[PDB]
Amino acid sequence: VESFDLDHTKVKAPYVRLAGVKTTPKGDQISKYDLRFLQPNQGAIDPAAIHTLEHLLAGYMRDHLEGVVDVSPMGCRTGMYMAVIGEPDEQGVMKAFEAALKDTAGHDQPIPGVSELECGNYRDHDLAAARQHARDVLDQGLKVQETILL
Amino acid sequence: NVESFDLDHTKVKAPYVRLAGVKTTPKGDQISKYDLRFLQPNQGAIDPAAIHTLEHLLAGYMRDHLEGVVDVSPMGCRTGMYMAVIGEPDEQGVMKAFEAALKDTAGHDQPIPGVSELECGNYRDHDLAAARQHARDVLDQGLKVQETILL
Ligand code: MET
Ligand SMILES: [Zn+2]
Numbered sequence: 001v002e003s004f005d006l007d008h009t010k011v012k013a014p015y016v017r018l019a020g021v022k023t024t025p026k027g028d029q030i031s032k033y034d035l036r037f038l039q040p041n042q043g044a045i046d047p048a049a050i051h052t053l054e055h056l057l058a059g060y061m062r063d064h065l066e067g068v069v070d071v072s073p074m075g076c077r078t079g080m081y082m083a084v085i086g087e088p089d090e091q092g093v094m095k096a097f098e099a100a101l102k103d104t105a106g107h108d109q110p111i112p113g114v115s116e117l118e119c120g121n122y123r124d125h126d127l128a129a130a131r132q133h134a135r136d137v138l139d140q141g142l143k144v145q146e147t148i149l150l
Numbered sequence: 151n152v153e154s155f156d157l158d159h160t161k162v163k164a165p166y167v168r169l170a171g172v173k174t175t176p177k178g179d180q181i182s183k184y185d186l187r188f189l190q191p192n193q194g195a196i197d198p199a200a201i202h203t204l205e206h207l208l209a210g211y212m213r214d215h216l217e218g219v220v221d222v223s224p225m226g227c228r229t230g231m232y233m234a235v236i237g238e239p240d241e242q243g244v245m246k247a248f249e250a251a252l253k254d255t256a257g258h259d260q261p262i263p264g265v266s267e268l269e270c271g272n273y274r275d276h277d278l279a280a281a282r283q284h285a286r287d288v289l290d291q292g293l294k295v296q297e298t299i300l301l
């Protein structure tokens with residue numbers, strides 16, 4: 001399936017979960033992952049904080065994982081979505097996400113790409129909140145979440 | 151090291167469709183990523199609830215008009231969406247598909263697909279009225295294929 005029918009009341013955040021896999025015409029695979037920060041419907045990450053997380057993780061995830069096609073916030077704002085070129089590898093993605101979260105928690109330099117030239121809403125950021133969201137996930141501890149279908 | 155930061159956001163002219171990048175799998179298949187821009191960078195942003203609804207609506211509507219869709223995701227800057235597609239670059243065809251999907255979005259008077267505590271991580275944070283108007287605004291202004299201007 002390209003997108004499994006997930007029961008959001010059954011998962012246990014924070015986690016890494018293979019959200020789907022698409023086969024390309026030549027036989028390669030694109031794997032999609034649900035990088036869940038918060039428990040579905042128990043709160044959301046503020047828009048400025050998730051915007052900063054996107055800027056930081058776009059770089060940090062790529063520092064720890066090859067084949068990343070996109071790292072983007074989810075509309076529900078409880079986590080990030082990522083598409084990767086490669087066979088499903090939840091364990092490898094979890095370790096990469098963990099390393100990237102440590103980079104994020106300790107990011108005390110200016111936020112990369114924040115300017116009128118490089119960002120579509122450079123006034124809407126929050127490094128302190130992004131760093132703390134990363135710290136909270138690490139404190140809670142990641143796990144590979146199984147997909148529970150509705 | 152993030153390609154997104156290399157686009158000169160002061161030079162583009164929203165709304166538009168723009169090929170943001172192309173990657174190839176080990177065997178040679180192309181994965182094209184498109185910048186589907188609703189608002190002019192830094193001149194305002196789409197409300198979180200509205201962009202959340204757009205994500206739900208375009209997920210189905212883009213697939214109805216275009217093959218090989220990987221996903222449609224909202225941008226953190228909330229001025230547009232990113233969409234990866236399995237296939238060679240085709241900005242013109244993607245523009246036509248986005249145009250048809252926006253017509254479907256603007257006229258969407260049925261329930262928002264996938265909205266319930268079971269199917270969505272923040273089911274109360276939606277705004278169909280606002281999403282439909284944003285689709286209507288893009289169509290009113292008119293889409294075009296935007297060339298990438300590098301910094
Ligand atoms: C604006 S930070 C970059 C985010 C973009 N979705 C990426 O995959 O790099
Ligand atoms: Zn930005």
Ligand SMILES: [Zn+2]
Binds near residue numbers: 075264270271
């Ligand atoms: Zn949702």
